[PDB]
Amino acid sequence: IDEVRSKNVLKQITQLINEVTNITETFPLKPGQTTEGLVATLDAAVANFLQTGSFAISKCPIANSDPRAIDLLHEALGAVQDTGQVMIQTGRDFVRDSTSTNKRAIATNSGRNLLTAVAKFLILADSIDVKVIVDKVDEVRETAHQMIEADTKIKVDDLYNLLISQIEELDITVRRRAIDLVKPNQRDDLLAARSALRQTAPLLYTSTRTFVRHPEHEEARRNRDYTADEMHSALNALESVLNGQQPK
């Protein structure tokens, strides 16, 4: 549970685990419902989870770039399908012999296993969602790399035009991630790195642009090197914190 870094995930899994392991009171059927209907609903809910899960995985922007990641996701979804099958079977056994304390216990155990598999899927899903953010950091890093290496003023401007948009995109996702982070120190560290990136990139633009125009100018070289180092540190800091590590 201590590896869970998303509050959205944390609350969902807390619901999953607490509710199914803390059943005390029981209730009659809701109006119009049947024992067979309870199993039918469960069956449909398992199916819909699998369908939505498959769609979500197929749309994941790093589907190409990270094949082992997608493989883990399919594996974890498969564990939901499997425990789901056991739940539907033992659940059916229970509702058909609903006074059997022992069949209730077995069905309850099946439920724990299924909702735990759902929780593990969500935890893995968050880690892949984080990899997507890290991929965006890498994109910013490469564009900045190219900007530093550019040999013409026109290239520096065109690359900074790209960088502006990439950093704006990254800024949105990082701010939202910060709001969702469980640990306030990771939150604060992520926001600090965000701020450093926003301050450093415009300075990298103007230091690189001045240096391509005046290469003989040794303070211009120094300033560009210094701002480049600052840029690299901020990007590394974002990646470090997204991965649950301290920056620097």
Binding site: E25, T26, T35, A45, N48, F49, T52, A56, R104, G111
Partner: peptide, 27 residues
């Protein structure tokens, strides 16, 4: 949107359907 975000509603419904079955009092 993200995978976690997309799975919020189906997680709830699956949770709901499991709890509904397990909290059935019997005959």
């Amino acid at each position: 949107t993200s995978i976690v975000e997309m799975m919020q509603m189906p997680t709830q419904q699956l949770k709901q359907s499991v709890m509904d079955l397990l909290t059935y009092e019997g005959s």
